[PDB]
Design an enzyme around this catalytic site. Structure first.
Site, mmCIF file in Angstrom:
data_model
loop_
_atom_site.group_PDB
_atom_site.id
_atom_site.type_symbol
_atom_site.label_atom_id
_atom_site.label_comp_id
_atom_site.label_asym_id
_atom_site.label_seq_id
_atom_site.Cartn_x
_atom_site.Cartn_y
_atom_site.Cartn_z
ATOM 1 N N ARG A 1 -36.411 -16.508 -93.193
ATOM 2 C CA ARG A 1 -35.081 -16.598 -93.054
ATOM 3 C C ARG A 1 -34.524 -15.392 -92.055
ATOM 4 O O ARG A 1 -34.924 -14.586 -92.066
ATOM 5 C CB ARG A 1 -34.761 -16.059 -94.577
ATOM 6 C CG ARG A 1 -33.168 -15.998 -94.908
ATOM 7 C CD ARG A 1 -32.514 -15.384 -96.363
ATOM 8 N NE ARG A 1 -31.166 -15.208 -96.062
ATOM 9 C CZ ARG A 1 -30.291 -14.073 -96.271
ATOM 10 N NH1 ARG A 1 -31.043 -13.104 -97.124
ATOM 11 N NH2 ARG A 1 -29.175 -14.017 -96.263
ATOM 12 N N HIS B 1 -24.485 -13.391 -91.041
ATOM 13 C CA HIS B 1 -24.788 -12.327 -91.514
ATOM 14 C C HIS B 1 -24.341 -11.009 -90.948
ATOM 15 O O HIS B 1 -24.886 -10.033 -90.606
ATOM 16 C CB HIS B 1 -26.463 -12.076 -91.392
ATOM 17 C CG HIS B 1 -27.139 -11.157 -92.410
ATOM 18 N ND1 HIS B 1 -28.134 -11.457 -93.248
ATOM 19 C CD2 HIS B 1 -27.145 -10.000 -92.763
ATOM 20 C CE1 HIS B 1 -28.871 -10.569 -93.738
ATOM 21 N NE2 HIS B 1 -28.151 -9.665 -93.741
ATOM 22 N N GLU C 1 -24.068 -12.524 -98.443
ATOM 23 C CA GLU C 1 -23.321 -11.544 -99.261
ATOM 24 C C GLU C 1 -22.077 -11.376 -98.959
ATOM 25 O O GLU C 1 -21.436 -10.151 -98.494
ATOM 26 C CB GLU C 1 -24.247 -10.073 -99.195
ATOM 27 C CG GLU C 1 -25.740 -10.300 -99.684
ATOM 28 C CD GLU C 1 -26.609 -8.791 -99.358
ATOM 29 O OE1 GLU C 1 -25.972 -8.070 -98.745
ATOM 30 O OE2 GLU C 1 -27.559 -8.804 -100.252
ATOM 31 N N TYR D 1 -31.963 -5.729 -105.500
ATOM 32 C CA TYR D 1 -32.829 -4.344 -105.551
ATOM 33 C C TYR D 1 -32.810 -3.192 -106.378
ATOM 34 O O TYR D 1 -33.419 -2.628 -106.607
ATOM 35 C CB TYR D 1 -32.595 -4.029 -104.188
ATOM 36 C CG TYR D 1 -31.221 -3.905 -103.685
ATOM 37 C CD1 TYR D 1 -30.372 -2.847 -104.101
ATOM 38 C CD2 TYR D 1 -30.719 -4.828 -102.445
ATOM 39 C CE1 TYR D 1 -29.089 -2.992 -103.594
ATOM 40 C CE2 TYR D 1 -29.361 -4.589 -102.262
ATOM 41 C CZ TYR D 1 -28.466 -3.799 -102.889
ATOM 42 O OH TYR D 1 -27.244 -3.677 -102.370
ATOM 43 N N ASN E 1 -29.731 -12.275 -104.187
ATOM 44 C CA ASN E 1 -30.389 -11.094 -103.723
ATOM 45 C C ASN E 1 -30.416 -9.833 -104.779
ATOM 46 O O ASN E 1 -29.408 -9.933 -105.468
ATOM 47 C CB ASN E 1 -29.497 -10.212 -102.623
ATOM 48 C CG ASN E 1 -29.873 -11.323 -101.070
ATOM 49 O OD1 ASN E 1 -30.301 -12.173 -101.009
ATOM 50 N ND2 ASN E 1 -29.014 -10.666 -100.262
ATOM 51 N N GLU F 1 -33.654 -12.223 -100.971
ATOM 52 C CA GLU F 1 -33.624 -10.891 -100.641
ATOM 53 C C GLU F 1 -34.257 -10.098 -101.727
ATOM 54 O O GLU F 1 -33.364 -9.988 -102.761
ATOM 55 C CB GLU F 1 -32.305 -10.253 -99.930
ATOM 56 C CG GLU F 1 -32.351 -8.891 -99.108
ATOM 57 C CD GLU F 1 -31.286 -8.222 -99.221
ATOM 58 O OE1 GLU F 1 -30.642 -7.806 -100.488
ATOM 59 O OE2 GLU F 1 -30.841 -7.513 -98.078
#
Length: 436
Positions: A75, A119, A164, A288, A286, A342
């Site tokens: 990606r 991005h 995002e 985290y 994504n 991600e």
């Protein structure tokens, strides 16, 4: 063991501004990250994307790294101003040729390219005309996306419109911590709305130009939890995929977003909703971190710190979150395909005397999340792939180079790459198609 489905895409992910450097090489236009990072006070240590990982010159070696690790998908993102230096109009063949060489090389090596159209490096020329605040960006974005599809769609078959968009709108236009660096709530919600319109126009043009490919969109997500016994229902709906997937699948913003933000949205925003519903082929999520959340009268929500282990970002490590969010997305919108586009962590990596980078902390992080993703697949979530962020240590936005997310260490003084223990570990996961 934990084997993944036949043909599961194991990947790594990067972004153009974070790794490439040479932002003005070969007739490229300025991006808003170039101008933001050159503005004193915006980025830690005054760091910029001027050199970064020098991937603009070292791209072949980097792909040779991906190959050698046996990673099956990559990606990466395209810098809009390398392609159209003024945002619209003139197309820059040298910019196209940079990415053409990368695509061909990946294909020759049997690595599947996933291309992120946007991005965060908006052409500066378009920011002068208000950027994501201007309704005309749906036209500008469609014209840009069209160029990409015409030039690369014969080889690239997996496309992402936006990375995002919550971050682009809110961190860029409400918090002011990312380019273009604004703090206006009315602008931030108009950016939300234009990001959706622009996404949908690009998908419309894709259907007309790349009749054999697939397109989707990528969202950031936290795992939110209540401090007692609704601020959590708001955080989910605002910070996570529903802000965008509610429009795309259902044709309106989620309920608690409207309670908070109706005043800030365009007056006749529902007029655009039918077009926003343009069919997508997949959702990228994504993930985290998780957060403890409480109503606080002093957006009416604050976070409560928990004694949990944290990364160098100070982000609480909550691996079950990746499971929760995958379950929740099937539950809410049942997209046909999901990818984790991600997932990764920042730790204070050092090179040992032995020449290696012993990031056991990052192995533990990746294994725990990959295990939860496995779980979701066992319970019928149509997860088709998983992308580690990042291949390389790189420019971490307003944190600059002080935060390392790579499975490959980059010594910036020399540009030497050193595969970290986490990189070797992940490469074994890919080869075996899962954990053990």
């Amino acid at each position: 063991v934990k084997k993944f489905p036949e043909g599961f895409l194991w990947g790594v992910a990067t972004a153009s501004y974070q790794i490439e450097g040479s932002p003005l090489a070969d007739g490229a236009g300025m991006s808003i990250w170039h101008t933001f990072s050159h503005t004193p006070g915006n980025v830690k240590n005054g760091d910029t994307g001027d050199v970064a990982c020098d991937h603009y010159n070292r791209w072949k070696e980097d792909i040779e790294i991906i190959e050698k690790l046996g990673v099956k998908a990559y990606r990466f993102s395209i810098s809009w101003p390398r392609i159209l230096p003024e945002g619209t109009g003139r197309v820059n063949q040298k910019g196209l040729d940079f990415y053409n060489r990368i695509i061909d090389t990946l294909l020759e090596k049997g690595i599947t390219p996933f291309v992120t159209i946007y991005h965060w490096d908006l052409p500066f020329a378009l920011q002068l005309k208000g950027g994501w605040a201007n309704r005309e960006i749906a036209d500008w974005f469609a014209e840009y996306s069209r160029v990409l599809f015409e030039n690369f769609g014969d080889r690239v078959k997996n496309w992402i419109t936006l990375n995002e968009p919550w971050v682009v709108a809110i961190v860029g236009h409400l918090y002011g911590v990312h380019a273009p660096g604004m703090r206006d709530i009315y602008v931030a919600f108009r950016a939300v709305h234009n990001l959706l319109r622009a996404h949908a126009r690009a998908v419309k043009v894709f259907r007309e130009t790349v009749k054999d490919g697939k397109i989707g969109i990528v969202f950031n997500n936290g795992y939110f939890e209540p401090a007692s016994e609704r601020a959590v229902r708001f955080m989910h709906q605002f910070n996570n995929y529903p802000l965008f997937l509610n429009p795309i699948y259902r044709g309106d913003y989620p309920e608690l977003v409207l309670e908070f933000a109706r005043e800030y949205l365009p007056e006749n925003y529902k007029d655009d909703m039918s077009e926003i519903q343009e069919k997508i082929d997949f959702v990228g999520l994504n993930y985290y971190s998780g957060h403890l959340v409480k109503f606080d009268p002093d957006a009416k929500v604050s976070f409560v710190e928990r004694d949990l282990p944290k990364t160098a970002m100070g982000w609480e490590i909550v691996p079950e979150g990746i499971y929760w969010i995958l379950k929740k997305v099937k539950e809410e919108y049942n997209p046909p395909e999901v990818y984790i586009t991600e997932n990764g962590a920042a730790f204070d990596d050092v090179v040992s005397e032995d020449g290696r980078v012993h990031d056991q902390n990052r192995i533990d992080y990746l294994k725990a999340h990959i295990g939860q993703a496995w779980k979701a697949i066992q319970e019928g979530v149509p997860l088709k792939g998983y992308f580690v962020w990042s291949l390389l240590d790189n420019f971490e936005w307003a944190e600059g180079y002080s935060k390392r997310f790579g499975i490959v260490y980059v010594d910036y003084s020399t540009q030497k790459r050193i595969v970290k223990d986490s990189g070797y570990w992940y490469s074994n996961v890919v080869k075996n198609n899962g954990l053990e």
